[PDB]
Design a protein around this ligand. Structure first.
Ligand SMILES: CC(C)(COP(=O)(O)OP(=O)(O)OC[C@H]1O[C@@H](n2cnc3c(N)ncnc32)[C@H](O)[C@@H]1OP(=O)(O)O)[C@@H](O)C(=O)NCCC(=O)NCCS
Ligand SMILES: CC(C)(COP(=O)(O)OP(=O)(O)OC[C@H]1O[C@@H](n2cnc3c(N)ncnc32)[C@H](O)[C@@H]1OP(=O)(O)O)[C@@H](O)C(=O)NCCC(=O)NCCS
Ligand SMILES: CC(C)(COP(=O)(O)OP(=O)(O)OC[C@H]1O[C@@H](n2cnc3c(N)ncnc32)[C@H](O)[C@@H]1OP(=O)(O)O)[C@@H](O)C(=O)NCCC(=O)NCCS
Ligand SMILES: *C(=O)CCCC[C@@H]1SC[C@@H]2NC(=O)N[C@@H]21
Ligand SMILES: *C(=O)CCCC[C@@H]1SC[C@@H]2NC(=O)N[C@@H]21
Lengths: 69, 537, 537, 537
């Protein structure tokens, strides 16, 4: 599963690559709303099965950002 | 009371009279015209661009909200005159006091035509000086909100500090707390800054399909987590009238919303708390316009102030305290349109006895709860070796304590010059008079033009004297040149009213008429007892 | 109470930690070093020229006056920094709170070395700001006057208006009336303006053959009816102690003068007014310097404030209110050096919840008479269409009313960013916190750098869009450039503290030490009952 | 204010209307008639047996003492209806407010005819309830004492406890202390208990050869150490006015006694302390009768409250606040017989919106010192899963703190239903509204008939369900039957008014003039400043 943009904002760095094996909260996608960076980590250690948020993608509150498997 | 009369000594037909009167009226027409240009707002250009959107003009919203034919005392209209780079009419906010449902109220409205209605530094300062007169004189407040935000380019002089924007909300909530109703009428955009004037107010009104209260308008909102929304959607009139609750009355348009506002001030159950022994209002005994000629055209030309008094008091009856003592300062009792007042007017220099006389008077007024009226035309304190050795220092101190401590209502009118310690000893701007006004002929400054260029240049050739040299009339003269003019320029009324060191420049012949209005307006608020500090004997 | 403990999660050993700790500590040395330069005064130059006249230097007069090793809280040391053209160290006047005969006192003295100790605008702003702290907290006042006059060239910002010079006397007569003694020590020139500080003060002291109080010194007095006489003749120490009576105490020299001073502060029959239920003072659970590494160096990288609280409160005991609700705002009770305090620290944004949480907390602290401490690190109020239609507008306002109205001592420290509505709701400068401080890493502005540049540039291409055109990234980029930098500039601690928007920049790691000092001093004055305005529900 | 008008929407001639109107007008006549019976006292039986002794009857003494044609507002006449075994008319005590010597006075008199005038438990309750309205509204009191003792058989409900008998003297002595004169007129027997009503009263009057004030009459006194003596000698009228001094004025008969009483009320130097901005009283715009047909006849039939409003206020002018927000509750300002008042009428359920709307409203009225008027027709609070998690709980509380704390005059009328939370949130019995009334159609209860039958019987088959059983249609039906009717019975006005949970049931058509009288007499007492508890935000 995932958190996918815990809030609404603008992505500036999408670390964990499509496919990789996470750790224990690896900031998978780093969001930024109102001059403040909101890195959404990973609450249940596994692998990343597909991320849809190429840096800049100014998604919304709910949008699908990254998903385990 | 036929002894308390002031028999004039002025000849209205005299040539000298007409001469003075001449230049004076000219000065008044000088102001008449500029105030006219200021009524223009952001210029017929955007102004018409305004009425286009179906929005009533700021100055007209007021005339409509007022009581039929009620008077209106405008505050600092020369606000921001040639101060900021551009022209920013009456600082982009019109404010004044006027009857609304039989209650004298404080109205504050923005000119969305002036640089977008945004808050320039002075704008904020003007909005706040209104709130002071409001809290100081107990006038309920009607905010006719229609502003962009705060002038982003100059934020550093508009956002942080104590006296900045935000002190606007501080005063609002304190007034609401001290039972001085806070009303708000939203008739345009109200982005972030101004979003609070309506959120923090006893009662709030919005014009549908026109008003918008939101912490972040579409600009900022898209610049946050993307999202693109219309204004009406984000924070429209219907969103805060039926949805959230940031507003209270849903108005159909400018006219409606003002009508709704009227009605709010109607169920206020308001009662005035001041209270004096006002008496039968009787007019002067000399036409108030005659003043034009009483005042010399020669700024440093000596005239008797008793003559300006006989043209403002009722029945020209004035009873003078310490009649013939330190005559440099006239002190006396009389009434103004009923309301009894204690007067303190300059008649020249100001030796030590002038202060004692003045301090002692203020003690009698403060004891009887009689409003204080100051008429400034002070050139300074008499100096010298003996005069300083006599305590012209400590005695002058006596006067200031009394003045700063007086809790009755204080009123000041500049009818000559405020120079040096004088301004302070005669209830100047820093002594919180309810209102302070300036005549067209008056000039204010720390000390004369060449008076300061004197010392300032004198030292330069005192440091270079014990420095093995002398100052040649060559640099000394290029040393006093720019100061001599700087003073001339920053001593003029417009430069003063532009910065709010006064609640405006007035028509010398209207004096009596403005003082009556002010007094009454300050009677909505209790006359508090007075507590004196220590007196340097 | 082993459960009210805050267990850190900070590793003082980690890499990340020393990283922050690094840039933080650099910033402190940046301040450490500038602070020293300002202790220079008018520079080694005239500074030595001072001691030559036999006059103790400013900062030394203070050390001598204080009680053996008593502490001293200096105010706005960065005053007027890089503000006027020239360099005017600590704005030509150093003030602060220190023990004198067992009484926390407000001491103000001028640096006759900085441009003649005359008053530049900021000098008056700072002198005034002290009498505010004096009044607001009831600390007797010691003025160590040694100044020229008012800086003549910039008078239009030193003499007229309400909060300009002369408001100095106002405040003095008023405090003297409210029984906060006013004491003066004349140890230099005292021409015209500052002439009243000594004349309007319960008790006055003069240094013979050095002090001079005259309304018009020899420069001016010769510019009068001619006349030529010396300084000591006109208004020296012997003229005013033996003859006039403008002085009360005849001192032999700077050191003696200060001694006489202390003796006055001795027979003040002074008693403190505050009253809290302070307990025995227990130190925190973690080195206060650990803070350097608690604060990210990455401006907008989120961290948990509870870690900051943990290093200031006593025994790192913190009882948290609405623990898990509107988490963006942290609220709780605990003590600091014994005195009980209520904390409100930002932990992120500020959605409606937070505001309500906060308003509600203030209500409780206001009802139990516990002082409030605000810890700002607010980036703003979450914006959006739902958040707005949800009243994040009016909810935020409930917070301000609360803060604005609270009559319990309030204290503010900027440990992050004060940007927008945030600054206000968190007891910013405009809400009279008795004291407000800034860490070196804190940045304060109306809103972010490009944030403003964003909107300010966007309207330009909206007025020009409905104008049949568009703005090419050519002019768009040139409309953003200036603003981007302007904000970066007007947001730094120096820029702020130089203008007094804060009573100074302090050492993050000493925060606790200063907070307890303040509090204690604020207890010289009663904690008043609180009266709330209307709360928009 | 031609837009402040409420334009009717009811057709006086509709069938619908005439239908409601019918059933309503019958309820009224049902009440008119009972009141009649109640004016009988102990029945023509002993009632005439009374006149025999030459004593005027209770109701007559009142009309004789009143000011020629003065109005009279009776308190709870349905007092003790179908409550105790026998019939005890208006609980053997008639009390109400009426003009005596141009003073709005509270008058209490006992019916010697009802079971010997003795005090049934309810007698004490009504007597004390009178004294409250007396204290809460600063109304001087006239006691027309003529009673046996306390109903000896039911003494455990009349003697001990806090607000039982004896709290009459407490009430009395405190009032005399608060300056609300305490006058007593003894026109019959006054043994033991009521012995103090006359002993403890500023001024006391006895009718000779009729009145008797003694701690123990001859019944008790013989039961003492024997001794046999008549009433007139033990403690007659001649005994206590010529000898003891337990009385002050010696009257010849009932009509005389009453005249002596007026006289005292005449030398009260009495002045009202209330203070409102009352204007010229203007009648409504729609027959007050019209109301009979405004109220639907079908209890749970939704109608528009704005219609009852338009038939009560002056010139049917009503300024609606939060016009279209949480419309389940209508709020607005208007005047009534001059006195300005804040109204909060129920219009349905009551979700969060409503409460905040109301709480914010009471703040505005409390801020302006305007009397509160509640119109209860509340079914209850909107329940649900999301409605609960939305804070319907805390927001409802917001309303109650407000109501609980408002110190302006509060007035409550039940025009629909008082059920559950609602009752409290609208200033129910427990929130001390100076007066609280009830219409005939109105019903009071913790919750509807079967509503309570629902839950009450449901737990029975949930405790009998986790008990391996179930409740068959047979036992659950017998579990809900008694409840269904119980509520129906303890929901009727008479049942309410019988127990004093209301100061009486009134004619919906008279509502207006009843509220006009109340208000006015509530102004014999100062409108106090209000202090709010803590608001759960
Ligand atoms: C206020 C606003 C809706 C203007 O609407 P409008 O009626 O169409 O008016 P315009 O957009 O034509 O504005 C015209 C003037 O407004 C001025 N202006 C608007 N907002 C401004 C601001 N915040 N600072 C400085 N100037 C501003 C522009 O400089 C422009 O000047 P110009 O006429 O000399 O070119 C729009 O500018 C806006 O969204 N501003 C938001 C302001 C803000 O975010 N402030 C927050 C800080 S408290
Ligand atoms: C105050 C005074 C005695 C100085 O004595 P001093 O110890 O010899 O000091 P100096 O004369 O060397 O003054 C040196 C500095 O004082 C400054 N200064 C003094 N008075 C000043 C004034 N009123 N305004 C501006 N600058 C002043 C000069 O600018 C000079 O600056 P610099 O050092 O950068 O060249 C002399 O300046 C004086 O008589 N001034 C009177 C001030 C006055 O009349 N003010 C009335 C206005 S309320
Ligand atoms: C009060 C009293 C003088 C009545 O005189 P009266 O005018 O002749 O009236 P009656 O004696 O005919 O009384 C008629 C009713 O009074 C009732 N009554 C009188 N005192 C009563 C008492 N204290 N408790 C209960 N009932 C009482 C009787 O029950 C009787 O009821 P009934 O008419 O249904 O038969 C006589 O009852 C008496 O002496 N009572 C003294 C009361 C007392 O001592 N109480 C002290 C307790 S605080
Ligand atoms: C113009 O003539 C000013 C007089 C100069 C005298 C000096 S300058 C300001 C000081 N205050 C005052 O009243 N006189 C002093
Ligand atoms: C920096 O990120 C500023 C945030 C911008 C959001 C807008 S600007 C000021 C308004 N008040 C507030 O709390 N945020 C709003």
């Amino acid at each position: 599963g995932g958190l996918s943009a815990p809030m609404n904002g603008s992505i500036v760095r999408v670390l964990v690559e499509p496919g990789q094996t996470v750790e224990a909260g690896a900031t998978l996608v780093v969001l930024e709303a109102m001059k403040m960076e909101h890195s959404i980590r990973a609450p249940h250690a596994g692998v990343v099965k597909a991320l849809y948020c190429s840096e800049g993608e100014l998604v919304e509150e709910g949008t699908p950002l990254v998903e385990l498997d | 009371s036929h002894m308390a009369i002031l028999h004039t000594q002025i000849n209205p037909r005299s040539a000298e009279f007409a001469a003075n009167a001449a230049t004076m009226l000219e000065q008044v027409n000088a102001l008449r015209t500029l105030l006219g240009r200021i009524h223009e707002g952001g210029g017929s250009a955007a102004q018409a661009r305004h009425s286009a959107r179906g929005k009533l003009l700021v100055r007209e919203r007021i005339n409509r909200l007022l009581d039929p034919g009620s008077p209106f005392l405008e505050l600092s209209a020369l606000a921001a005159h040639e101060v900021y780079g551009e022209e920013v009419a009456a600082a982009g906010i019109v404010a004044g006091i006027g009857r609304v449902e039989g209650v004298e109220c404080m109205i504050v409205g923005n000119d969305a035509t002036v640089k977008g209605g945004t808050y320039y530094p002075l704008t904020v300062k003007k909005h706040l000086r209104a709130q002071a007169i409001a809290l100081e004189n107990r006038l309920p407040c009607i905010y006719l909100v229609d502003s962009g935000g705060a002038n982003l380019p100059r934020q550093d002089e508009v956002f942080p500090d104590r006296e900045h924007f935000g002190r606007i909300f501080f005063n609002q909530a304190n007034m609401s707390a001290r039972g001085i109703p806070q009303i708000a009428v939203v008739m345009g955009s109200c982005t972030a800054g101004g979003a609070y004037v309506p959120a923090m107010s006893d009662e709030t009104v919005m014009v549908r399909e026109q008003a918008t209260i939101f912490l972040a308008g579409p600009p900022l909102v898209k610049a946050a987590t993307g999202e693109v929304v219309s204004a009406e959607e984000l924070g429209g009139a219907d969103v805060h009238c039926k949805v959230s609750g940031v507003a209270d009355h849903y108005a159909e348009d400018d006219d409606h919303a003002l009508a709704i506002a009227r009605r709010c001030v109607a169920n206020l159950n308001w009662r005035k708390q001041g209270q004096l022994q006002c008496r039968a209002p009787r007019a002067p005994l000399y036409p108030a316009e005659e003043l034009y000629g009483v005042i010399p055209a020669d700024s440093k030309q000596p005239y008797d102030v008793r003559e300006v008094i006989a043209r403002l008091v009722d029945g020209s009856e004035f009873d003078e305290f310490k009649a013939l003592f330190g005559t440099t300062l006239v002190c006396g009792f009389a009434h103004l349109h009923g309301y009894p007042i204690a007067i303190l007017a300059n008649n020249g220099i100001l030796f030590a006895e002038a202060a004692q006389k003045g301090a002692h008077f203020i003690e009698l007024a403060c004891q009887r709860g009689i409003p204080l009226l100051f008429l400034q035309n002070i050139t300074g304190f008499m100096v010298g070796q003996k005069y300083e050795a006599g305590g012209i220092a400590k005695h002058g101190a006596k006067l200031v304590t009394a003045v700063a401590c007086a809790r009755v209502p204080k009123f000041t009118v500049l009818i000559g010059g405020s120079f040096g310690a004088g301004n302070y000893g005669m209830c100047g701007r820093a002594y919180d008079p309810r209102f302070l006004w300036m005549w067209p002929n008056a000039r204010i400054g720390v000390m004369g033009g060449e008076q300061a260029a004197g010392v300032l240049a004198q030292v330069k050739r005192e440091q270079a004297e014990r420095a093995g040299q002398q100052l040649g009339v060559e640099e000394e003269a290029k040393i006093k040149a720019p100061i001599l003019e700087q003073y001339e320029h920053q001593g003029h009324p417009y430069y003063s009213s532009a910065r709010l060191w006064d609640d405006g420049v007035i028509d010398p012949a209207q004096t009596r008429e403005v003082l009556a209005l002010a007094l009454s307006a300050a009677l909505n608020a209790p006359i508090e007892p007075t507590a004196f500090g220590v007196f340097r004997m």
